[PDB]
Amino acid sequence: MPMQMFMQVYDEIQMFLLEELELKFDMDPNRVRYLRKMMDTTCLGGKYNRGLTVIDVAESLLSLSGARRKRVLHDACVCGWMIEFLQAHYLVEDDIMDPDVTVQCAINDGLLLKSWTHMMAMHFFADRPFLQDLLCRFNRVDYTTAVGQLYDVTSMFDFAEFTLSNYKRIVKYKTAYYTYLLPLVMGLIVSEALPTVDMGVTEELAMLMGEYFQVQDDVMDCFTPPERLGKVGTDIQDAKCSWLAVTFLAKASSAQVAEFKANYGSGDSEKVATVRRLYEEADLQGDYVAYEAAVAEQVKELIEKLRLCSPGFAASVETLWGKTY
Amino acid sequence: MPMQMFMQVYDEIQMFLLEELELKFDMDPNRVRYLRKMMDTTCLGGKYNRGLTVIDVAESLLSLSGARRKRVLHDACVCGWMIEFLQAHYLVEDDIMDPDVTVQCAINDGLLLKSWTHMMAMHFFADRPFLQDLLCRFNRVDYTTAVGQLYDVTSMFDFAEFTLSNYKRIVKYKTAYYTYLLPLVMGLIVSEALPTVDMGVTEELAMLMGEYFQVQDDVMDCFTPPERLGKVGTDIQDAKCSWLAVTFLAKASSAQVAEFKANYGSGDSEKVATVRRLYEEADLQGDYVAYEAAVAEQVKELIEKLRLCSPGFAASVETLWGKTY
Ligand SMILES: CS(=O)(=O)Cc1c(Cl)cccc1Cl
Ligand SMILES: CS(=O)(=O)Cc1c(Cl)cccc1Cl
Numbered sequence: 001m002p003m004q005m006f007m008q009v010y011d012e013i014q015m016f017l018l019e020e021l022e023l024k025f026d027m028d029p030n031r032v033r034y035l036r037k038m039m040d041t042t043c044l045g046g047k048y049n050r051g052l053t054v055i056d057v058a059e060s061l062l063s064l065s066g067a068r069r070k071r072v073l074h075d076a077c078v079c080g081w082m083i084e085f086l087q088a089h090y091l092v093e094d095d096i097m098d099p100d101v102t103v104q105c106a107i108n109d110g111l112l113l114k115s116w117t118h119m120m121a122m123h124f125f126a127d128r129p130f131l132q133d134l135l136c137r138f139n140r141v142d143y144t145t146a147v148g149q150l151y152d153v154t155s156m157f158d159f160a161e162f163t164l165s166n167y168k169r170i171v172k173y174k175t176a177y178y179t180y181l182l183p184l185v186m187g188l189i190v191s192e193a194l195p196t197v198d199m200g201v202t203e204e205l206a207m208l209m210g211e212y213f214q215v216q217d218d219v220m221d222c223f224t225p226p227e228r229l230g231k232v233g234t235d236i237q238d239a240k241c242s243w244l245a246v247t248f249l250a251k252a253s254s255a256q257v258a259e260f261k262a263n264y265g266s267g268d269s270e271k272v273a274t275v276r277r278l279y280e281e282a283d284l285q286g287d288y289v290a291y292e293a294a295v296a297e298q299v300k301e302l303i304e305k306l307r308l309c310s311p312g313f314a315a316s317v318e319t320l321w322g323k324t325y
Numbered sequence: 326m327p328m329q330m331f332m333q334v335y336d337e338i339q340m341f342l343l344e345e346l347e348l349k350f351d352m353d354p355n356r357v358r359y360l361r362k363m364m365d366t367t368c369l370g371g372k373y374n375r376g377l378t379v380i381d382v383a384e385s386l387l388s389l390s391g392a393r394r395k396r397v398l399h400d401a402c403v404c405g406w407m408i409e410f411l412q413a414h415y416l417v418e419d420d421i422m423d424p425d426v427t428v429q430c431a432i433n434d435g436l437l438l439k440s441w442t443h444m445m446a447m448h449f450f451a452d453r454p455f456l457q458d459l460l461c462r463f464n465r466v467d468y469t470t471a472v473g474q475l476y477d478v479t480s481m482f483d484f485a486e487f488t489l490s491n492y493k494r495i496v497k498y499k500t501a502y503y504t505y506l507l508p509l510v511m512g513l514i515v516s517e518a519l520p521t522v523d524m525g526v527t528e529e530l531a532m533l534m535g536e537y538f539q540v541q542d543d544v545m546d547c548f549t550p551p552e553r554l555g556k557v558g559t560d561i562q563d564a565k566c567s568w569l570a571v572t573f574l575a576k577a578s579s580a581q582v583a584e585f586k587a588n589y590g591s592g593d594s595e596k597v598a599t600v601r602r603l604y605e606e607a608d609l610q611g612d613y614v615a616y617e618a619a620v621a622e623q624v625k626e627l628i629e630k631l632r633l634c635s636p637g638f639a640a641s642v643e644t645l646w647g648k649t650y
Contacts, residue, residue: 115468132457143440153429
């Protein structure tokens, strides 16, 4: 029912955007079918973890607070695809980072995917009293993500910023705000119960779950094989400010740090294996278990504090944390 | 006074955006000075033709309709920089079209410049009753520009689309909407006199002035030397759907079209000179004078129709047309 409704609204959103281009933007059918194939390629295929979270938060606030039910659920599906389209926009920009027409189309695809989030919001929420507040919070979170990408890209240019506090700043702005906090806020806006929750505890939970999610991703990028991870890990070659790097530099000797700096950020297969050897000898995978356990305790405690004022809203956060844990 | 006030508001807009990153986004001073230098590089240096147009439209509607004067003029300066920041966003995306950190920073700069238009609007217009209507029209024009870039990039991929009607469609969506129509609408919104004008005649004037502006740019790209144009013309090498191409294909013989197709879209210095020779022998620079004269007559006539219901608003359009002519 949730996934089936989320994909049914996708056909409604896609049909409007493509017909709007045909009727109001004078687009030929050849480009309409081109943009339909591009939209399905970039937006469909994922697990829809961000989009379905908006649905799970909305369905809890309407039953635990009937023409209003069908509207709130449909509004959450549109907001769910706004984030999925936004995620597709970020992924397209990442492919460009790593008269050529394929690059011109990639840049154009990234602009259309972002603008489509505004077009589907200005239409399905044209008469909603929260249209102005939704666009402002959506644009501020998108601006937050762009700032987080500046922290991540320039994390090794200005190992001084290879600290645990700066790592949290990267995860917070680059990932946690739009992946965990944005779906929760959008579920509150479509349910008209936004000021009825403690945003401080809600924001604190979103940053902890994103931190828990990024630490697990950093370890799998280095140790999980490519066929079992789904991609090729490249954090060591790209000199990323990963959780393994900032934790190794804290418990390593002067020679181990010198050997780390002489091998980190290189594409050599032996230098990357040297960095993995330093991570293995430092027992970082043992500290990874203890670090994630402490974060999980902080999540289980803040949900109860959020439950004292948001009983149903905390039930969706546990489900959100359940799929992260 | 106009230019001096427009640059004074720039310092106010820049100071807010940078302090917001320092106070609300936890940005270190090294990156704040980095973003200050990037903002001045991408946004400053141009002629500010789009930004100053918003000021000229606003000052006419307040004197030809005193604490309201200072607010409307300041609101027009913020809207003027929203377009200038938007133009800088488009230019940065064009540089990308033609672990590399310089490309990651270029993509990040393009995202920040676009988001800065929303941040400066959500702040200086936070209590304005037109904040929701301004963002929707701004996002729709930005979406219009992205669609126009799809028409321009794919103008030779799908010489069938090398027609005068499709050329007008490219100029309309790619350039005319955000360069000529957007500054006029923003001048009406800050003056609270938007529904007091004929938008049909206003839109028709914006597309004609943009068409008049693009035809002149296409001829200068081919004939004006690099030192006198400010850049190197490359429409022939890039196989662009220029006004010279769509006009040549209409008045050329079968061999001249065959010679055109065998030389258009190539970087060879002799093939580009062959295309220029075909343009010279077809007397296209003679038709360019007659085509621009007919467009100028249509502009001078629609301003009078717009004057019958918008006396002062048409005075700024003549000034807008005066700098285009
Ligand atoms: C979108 S994500 O990166 O997969 C994080 C996530 C997960 Cl893992 C499970 C449910 C919701 C979310 Cl937001
Ligand atoms: C921004 S532009 O491309 O220079 C077109 C223009 C001109 Cl030429 C003169 C005044 C206003 C405008 Cl919008």
